[PDB]
């Protein structure tokens, strides 16, 4: 399927144990997609002070359309030293590995895979 319904655990930035997916734009997009498929991906909501506490390159989920079955359609955009790889809508948050942190909420998304 071109899209997959996912429910992403929303994590507090200070709980996150693994603060990024790797060391290159291509690696972090690769790893983010693998973790999304494996159900091992968390979401951090972006506010003042969040991104400097995480590791670049960043992987964002961005709204791709204006929401089947409650699931917002999203796609992945990476960022490294202020350049983004991808073009999309509003940021829903930054993706990180999930390694058992307790979430504060779930974000229902329809991921363009």
UniProtKB/Swiss-Prot annotation:
Source organism superkingdom: Viruses
Places the protein is found: Host cytoplasm
Chain residue ranges for the region called Disordered: 1-113
Residues covered by the CoV Nsp1 globular domain: 2-113
Function: Inhibits host translation by associating with the open head conformation of the 40S subunit. The C-terminus binds to and obstructs ribosomal mRNA entry tunnel. Thereby inhibits antiviral response triggered by innate immunity or interferons. The nsp1-40S ribosome complex further induces an endonucleolytic cleavage near the 5'UTR of host mRNAs, targeting them for degradation. This inhibits the integrated stress response (ISR) in the infected cell by preventing EIF2S1/eIF2-alpha phosphorylation upstream of stress granule formation and depletes host G3BP1.
UniProt protein name: Host translation inhibitor nsp1
Organism annotation: Severe acute respiratory syndrome coronavirus 2
Encoding gene, per UniProt annotation: rep
């Amino acid at each position: 399927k071109t899209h997959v319904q996912l429910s992403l655990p929303v994590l507090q930035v200070r709980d996150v144990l693994v603060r990024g997916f790797g060391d290159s734009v291509e690696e972090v997009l690769s790893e983010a997609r693998q973790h999304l498929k494996d159900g091992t991906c968390g979401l951090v909501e972006v506010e003042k002070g969040v991104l400097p506490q995480l590791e670049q390159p960043y992987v964002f989920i961005k709204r791709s359309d204006a929401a089947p079955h409650g699931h917002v359609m999203v796609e992945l955009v990476a960022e490294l030293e202020g350049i983004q790889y991808g073009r999309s809508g509003e940021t829903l948050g930054v993706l990180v590995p999930h390694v058992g942190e307790i979430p504060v909420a779930y974000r229902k998304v329809l991921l363009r895979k």
